[PDB]
Design a protein around this nucleic acid. Structure first.
Length: 831
RNA sequence: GUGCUGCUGUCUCCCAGACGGGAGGCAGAACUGCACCUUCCAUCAGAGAACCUCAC
DNA sequence: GAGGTTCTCTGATGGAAGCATATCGT
DNA sequence: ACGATATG
């Protein structure tokens, strides 16, 4: 599997011949879609351009196979089935009939084809014989053939040159079943299909590639659906026998009368009947179309399709597709992705393209093009320049570095034995991310961190990135987003003022004490004039939203351009402001939804498409910029190991992205730049000091300052640096210190430690001496680990393992000191 | 190329109706900034909305 | 925050993708 | 040596 990065380039004046080739390629690809399914001789479901699903019967397969050439489709049935499953990759991966699904069209489509009657590349037999007959002594052949075969014919195979004889014997003894089926069909003279449009071999390869890949995907999904339905039915039938008697005949009538109006064993059994029945067993077949579901009309340089000669002049590409009708020259609209490109024909059927994506530096990127693909969108054509790239080299020393620091203490993986650079990364929204960088073998001055089995390290480089660029804009994106949230609730109640009378009691202080101050609307009692007073605010909401979006636009088109950061905390506030504005606009659009009225299958089908498009675009842009700043921060400091918080474990990156796809993108782009990363457990990183390794206070009024005590003097430090170091410190110490153990009580105050994870197993050994331990109580409401010779949270503190009630009070006792003392008398750490 | 990403003027369909909101098209003006692997497909779950029912 | 209702859109979590060599024959 | 197949 090569590495792949891709982009699109526009072509404007497409000649009629290429348009015809495009459409014919889709039509033939649809023909392949249909003919493979027909040869499967298994009925399926076709989803038309509309939502309707059609049950294509066996007759529609039979008559189509009749048209395609098979005048007696039933008589040759098993043989067609075997060929069909071969091109769709339903045979064994080793010794496959067609390693590339395309390679069947020589036998399927042509008229005088020699495919299937060759031995020149038969694996390891003809090549071995041809090699030995030249410069070997007829003795290592025995070793080579015994090695693979662990018969007397092999003696004659090397007794003479006999290439044709061995080829014939291999084609006889070794018959890949998918090709034997095709030869049998062509012997009957029914296999060469009548392709509706006349295309040469190269274009038929390209069509069959896409048709076959669509069939392979759909077949895999169908098999998954069938297997899942079978397994769920197995679970239901296992549960049905169980212990429940035939009394389950009654919950049927019970559910009937319930749904007409609309027990543990009865309810659970009911779910299985409903869950099993509604699940589909088969997927839908979506046939290819020119405009509905386009396929890439691929043009390869080895046989996949018509060859192309990619060139470049100035700041744009020059594509020439060598069609059978003639050479067709296309010029490319210049792309900032492949800006100022240079092209070069290589010695391996490829073009070496060197271009420049970004505009900050002039860094030139190198890739190889080996296939170009053609699609259309909104009647406008495109080529997919799907190129390759070699990722940056990662030292074998980094791999031994990553394995060592990842391992729990009870594993003994080797020391890195070199000077690595480790990174600490926290992730937030206002503080997009913060970092701490340490160098192994070099501790000079800073927050010194233990390193497992090595000397300590000092974090020289520390910083907070992302952040709020302009203070005013961030506050305005927050005032409006608060208003947009509170208007959606307000007009839910507003209608009930007019729809009902005097509302209720639970709402009364919910409307007055919370919603009126929020939506900033004066309350009028007369219903007719409540529509006007609510409409003018929604106008005023848009009128100030447009202002904000325009000032957000001008972050890139003023003299403030130089100060505009790569990523800001405004990227996330805008996303929520777009989100809340969407709900409010949706709610006001249904201000007329009155009495009992519901959303219909029709109505308005394009509602708020501009906002949804802006929502997805802003997110995709935010994550790409977020990854760049992280990777830019990693490369600059010489980092090769990145410790990240496992965020899988409002004001969070969650509710904007899935918990994982954020981390996946960062790791992928780090690995392209030759930087390995690991996910560190993000427990107690924001509540534990990185200096004293003791619990502190995360200030609620100010979420950037973390208070702890050192030498009985209260200190403060940035809570993003504090967590960034605590993520890196955990990695370098191999999670040596834990701050929480789960324990369960059996009797008389002996809380038994629940060992679930291997990190707890190793930890107890370094203190107790056994892979298990107990908590004995002491005089001052504390505990102590003992350890046993062969669930309630507990918090460490000063070697005492206090409980949640007394851990909260210790945190609370420190808060009172902070509030009493004040930030003026609490010194700063970083600088 | 696709986005971040809008402004002015003018024009057409739609939902409310005389408060307002949502799709779009051409026309210029302003701006030389940041980033950018993406195509296709099938299942099964969520978000919020909104109508019928609750006092949390 | 109780509890099916009917629809769009993610969103989940998968699936298939984005070419090599080999020789004959002129 | 390049083209026309063919198949790892």
């Amino acid at each position: 599997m090569p590495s792949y990065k891709s982009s699109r380039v526009l072509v404007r004046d497409v000649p009629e011949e290429l348009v015809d080739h495009y459409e014919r390629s889709h039509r033939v690809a649809a023909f392949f879609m249909r003919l493979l399914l027909a040869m499967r001789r298994e009925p399926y479901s076709l989803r038309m351009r509309d939502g309707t699903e059609r049950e294509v019967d066996l007759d529609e397969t039979d008559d189509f196979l009749r048209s395609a050439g098979c005048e007696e489709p039933d008589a040759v049935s098993d043989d067609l089935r075997s060929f069909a499953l071969a091109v769709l990759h339903q045979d064994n991966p080793k010794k496959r009939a067609f390693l590339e699904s395309e390679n069947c069209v020589s036998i399927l489509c042509l008229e005088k084809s020699a495919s299937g009657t060759r031995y020149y590349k038969r694996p390891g037999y003809q090549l071995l014989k041809k090699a030995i007959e030249e410069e070997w002594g007829w003795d290592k052949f025995e070793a080579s053939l015994l090695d693979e075969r662990t018969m007397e014919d092999w003696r004659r195979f090397f007794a003479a040159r006999d290439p044709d004889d061995l080829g014939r014997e291999l084609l006889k003894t070794d018959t890949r079943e998918g090709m034997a089926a095709a030869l049998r069909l062509r012997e009957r003279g029914v296999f060469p299909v009548s392709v509706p449009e006349h295309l040469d071999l190269d274009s038929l390869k390209a069509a069959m590639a896409s048709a076959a890949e669509r069939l392979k995907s759909w077949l895999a999904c169908n098999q998954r659906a069938v297997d899942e339905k079978s397994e769920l039915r197995k679970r239901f039938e296992e549960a049905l026998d169980g212990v429940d008697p035939e009394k389950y005949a009654l919950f049927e009538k019970f559910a009937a009368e319930l749904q007409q109006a609309d027990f543990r064993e009865l309810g659970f059994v009911y779910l299985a009947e409903r869950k099993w029945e509604r699940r589909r067993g088969g997927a839908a077949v979506t046939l290819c179309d020119a405009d509905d579901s386009p396929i890439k009309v691929r043009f390869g340089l080895t046989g996949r399709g018509r060859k192309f000669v990619l060139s470049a002049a100035g700041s744009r590409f020059l594509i020439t597709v060598k069609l059978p009708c003639g050479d067709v020259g296309l010029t490319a609209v210049p792309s900032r992705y492949f800006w100022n490109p240079s092209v070069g024909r290589t010695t391996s059927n490829s073009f070496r393209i060197e271009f420049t994506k970004r505009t900050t530096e002039n860094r030139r990127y190198v890739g190889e093009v080996k296939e170009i693909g053609l699609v259309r969108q909104r009647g406008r054509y495109y080529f997919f320049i799907d190129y390759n790239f070699d990722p940056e080299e990662v030292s074998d020393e980094t791999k031994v570095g990553r394995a060592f620091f990842r391992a729990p203490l009870n594993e003994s993986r080797p020391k890195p034995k070199d000077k690595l650079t480790v990174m600490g990364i926290d992730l937030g929204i206002n503080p997009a991310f913060a970092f701490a960088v340490c160098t192994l073998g070099e501790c000079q001055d800073g927050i010194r961190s233990p390193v497992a089995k090595m000397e300590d390290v000092s974090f020289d480089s520390t910083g907070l990135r992302g952040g709020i660029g302009s203070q005013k804009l961030h506050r305005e994106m927050h005032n409006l987003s608060d208003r947009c949230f509170y208007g959606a609730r307000y007009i839910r109640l507003s209608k009930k003022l007019r729809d009902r009378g005097a509302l209720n009691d639970i709402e009364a202080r919910l409307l007055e004490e919370k919603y009126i101050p929020g939506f900033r609307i004066v309350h009028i009692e007369d219903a007719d004039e409540r529509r006007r007073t609510v409409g003018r605010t929604v106008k005023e909401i848009k009128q100030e939203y447009k202002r904000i979006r325009h000032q957000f636009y001008l972050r890139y088109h003023t003299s403030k351009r130089d100060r505009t950061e790569l990523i800001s905390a405004e990227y996330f506030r805008m996303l929520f402001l777009v989100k809340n504005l969407r709900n409010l606009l949706k709610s006001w659009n249904r201000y007329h939804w009155t009495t009992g009225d519901r959303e219909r299958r029709g109505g308005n089908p394009d509602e708020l498409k501009s906002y949804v498009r802006y929502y997805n675009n802003l997110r995709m842009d935010t994550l790409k910029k977020l990854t760049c700043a992280i990777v830019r921060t990693a490369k600059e400091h010489g980092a090769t190991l990145v410790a990240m918080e496992n965020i899988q474990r409002e004001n969070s990156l969650l509710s904007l992205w899935a918990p994982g796809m954020v981390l996946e993108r960062v790791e992928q782009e780090l690995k392209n730049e030759g930087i390995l990363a690991w996910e560190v457990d993000p427990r107690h990183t924001s509540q534990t000091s990185c200096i004293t390794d003791e619990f502190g206070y995360r200030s609620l009024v100010a979420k950037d300052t973390f208070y702890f005590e050192q030498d009985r003097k209260i200190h403060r430090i940035d809570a993003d640096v504090n967590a960034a170091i605590n993520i890196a410190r955990r990695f370098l110490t191999r999670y040596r210190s834990l701050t929480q153990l789960w324990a369960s009580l059996l009797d008389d105050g002996r809380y038994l430690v629940n060992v679930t994870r291997q990190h707890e197993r190793a930890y107890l050994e370094l203190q107790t001496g056994a892979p298990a331990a107990t908590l004995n109580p002491t005089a001052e409401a504390s505990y102590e680990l003992v350890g046993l010779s062969p669930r309630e949270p507990f918090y460490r503190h000063e070697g005492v393992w206090l409980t949640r009630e007394k851990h909260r009070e210790q945190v609370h006792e420190l808060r009172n000191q902070v509030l009493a003392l004040g930030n003026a008398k609490i010194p700063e750490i970083r600088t």
